[PDB]
Design a binder for these strands. Sequence first.
RNA 1: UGACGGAGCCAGCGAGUCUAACCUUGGCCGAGAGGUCUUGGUAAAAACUCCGUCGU
Lengths: 44, 59, 97, 125, 93, 253, 51, 24
Amino acid sequence: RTLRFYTSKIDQQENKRFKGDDDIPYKDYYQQVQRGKQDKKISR
Amino acid sequence: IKDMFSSAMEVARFEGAQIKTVSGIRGEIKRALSKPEGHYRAAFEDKILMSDIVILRSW
Amino acid sequence: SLVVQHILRLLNTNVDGNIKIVYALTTIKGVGRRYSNLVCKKADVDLHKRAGELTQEELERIVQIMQNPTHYKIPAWFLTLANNVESKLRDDLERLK
Amino acid sequence: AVPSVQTFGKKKSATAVAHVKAGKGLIKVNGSPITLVEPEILRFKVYEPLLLVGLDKFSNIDIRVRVTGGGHVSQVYAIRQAIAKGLVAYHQKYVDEQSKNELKKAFTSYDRTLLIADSRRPEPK
Amino acid sequence: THKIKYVLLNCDDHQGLLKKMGRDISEARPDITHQCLLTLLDSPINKAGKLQVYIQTSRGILIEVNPTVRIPRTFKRFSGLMVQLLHKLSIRS
Amino acid sequence: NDIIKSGLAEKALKALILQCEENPSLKNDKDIHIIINTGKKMGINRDNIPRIIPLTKYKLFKPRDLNILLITKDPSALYRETLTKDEHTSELFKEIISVKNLRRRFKGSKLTQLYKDFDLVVADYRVHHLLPEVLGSRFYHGSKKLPYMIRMSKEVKLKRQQMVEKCDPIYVRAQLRSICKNTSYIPNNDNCLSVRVGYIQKHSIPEILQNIQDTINFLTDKSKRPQGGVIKGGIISIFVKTSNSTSLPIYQF
Amino acid sequence: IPTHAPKYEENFNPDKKSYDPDRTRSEINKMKAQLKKERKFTMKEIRKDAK
Amino acid sequence: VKDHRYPGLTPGLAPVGLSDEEDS
RNA sequence: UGACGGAGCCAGCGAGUCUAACCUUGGCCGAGAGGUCUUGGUAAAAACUCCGUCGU
């Protein structure tokens, strides 16, 4: 937006890949129903 | 056959064991099926039916 | 002598302008070709257009369709034991001896 | 009884039965004209007899070919063999034998398979 | 390569071992291969994308080197790659 | 409307709704079914043809909501072209497949996958009786995804004449809206009968209770035969349950 | 030309296995492999004794 | 509506109503 | 020398009244045995030719 922003990018581009001689990196109602059915089956 | 055994390791013990059905058809336990567990293959002298029940006599 | 007539961001996704709107929108996760076709049809955007040629209002309409599908009546469908077994085997093996 | 002759063509499992009878050049394969025989790419193969001896001879006969078995290619070869054998047989029976000789010479000049079955019988070595 | 772990045979480090295999220690120097594979990839021609390297191992192995690679400069790592390279048949970025 | 007034029906459904939230095993159980004990043997063999029960007060679902599969007569070119092009039915169907295309492409484990992805199965009534062999036992066991027969066009078949083949998009959409909004039931040669009445987290307790009354009226009303009025001789009892939860009584004679 | 670094594991041993990121994944792989061996060896020995 | 080939059409046909035909 | 969909189309062997799941939710009848229904989960000709779409 601001012109200052673009200048930052432009300088960053100039400063902007190992090169030369570098090396690689080191390393409850329900329950009432249920009993009721069982009691009927049991009682029979 | 199924439900005779529970795991393939059990079938291992009884491979070659003599078997027969209700009808009187004789057979042999051939090998243990890898899937499902316990199922195995048997060869009978004649074609068996589904309704038959295969029996192994043990002591 | 005077005659006056590449990438876009949509739902946090980079979409290539050169690709057709339907198959360019397919890249967005959770969108199928049929869904992108329906979204374009609802947006009243010509499917023949390329993604770059889209205007701002068309892209906003597509975003509104994407974010509020129910509001625009989009169809809904578019929207340890091993060690125990080893121990059992060990017990069986030792017993076999 | 209308003059009619019958012939068989065979290639692998494919078998074709051809009836050639006095007619008007009405030629059909499995109840459809030749032009619809498939695959398209090999259609001219079935046309090989028709074009060789000239369409004028077929102008006085009708050919019915019924084909079963085999795949596409073997079916095509069965069709062409059946058509050629039927044409020669009819020319022998109800046309001069001179034309029979001319037909056989043209066919055996192009490709003998049209007349003799191509059986790649095994040969041990 | 030979297991001791597996190590790229060296003319100096492994002299007793190679005698056991019976191969002459004079012809047991991968360092020359290191040096050549250092200078070649480091030349401008490689940087210009016009140079590609192939290696023919004495045992008969043919290795292609993509121009992109950057081999380590110290010999010891390079031995590490080659034993990996010969066994897995490939190295990834 | 008595079954609505009785407080037991309210109490049961409240208990059932509380349960499905609490018990993990019921986390996947979403539908509410009512089990009706017909007094006598209804005497209708299970034909696997769903019969729709009109639920007047409320709509269970809308066709847009569900995955719908359409199984048509061969060739599907006419029906697929007609349904796809027309705006009303353009997006109505998840997939359209002919019978032979269905048999060839899907077999075995693929059939199970088809079962999961599609929520409703609708088929032309001509090809319905062929489906049991093709779809398999999973579709035709339990009645959750049992296919619904539909009619493509209002044309009728006459003796000694050939039915003219047409596809009528507006007619087709009319049935699927009826199917999705209204519940259905399948007769069988026994007392029991199960009818879906609601969906948990979507339908409020009065709505489910009202829907149950609609099911009872249509099913006991002799005037609605043969689609309705199959429960002759009264109802001994009704229960309410989900797929895996147990039966909670709501009415007893 | 772009330049990329080689990936490698120092002191590599082909008999030894690819290092796995997830210890649980590595450990269960160890357990499954042990299970397959012992099932095969026990299964083999059972047959011979039965014979 | 009845089809002599398929008696299964007559029972369990989807009822069609005026609300259904009308567009949403 | 792809994927998706649709369309066309071609074989030969094979015929024992014999051919083929599992685990569940509940209702009813029955002294019992069991019978029936209801219910969710898990497992279980091709090449070829033509047409249309995407695109490496």
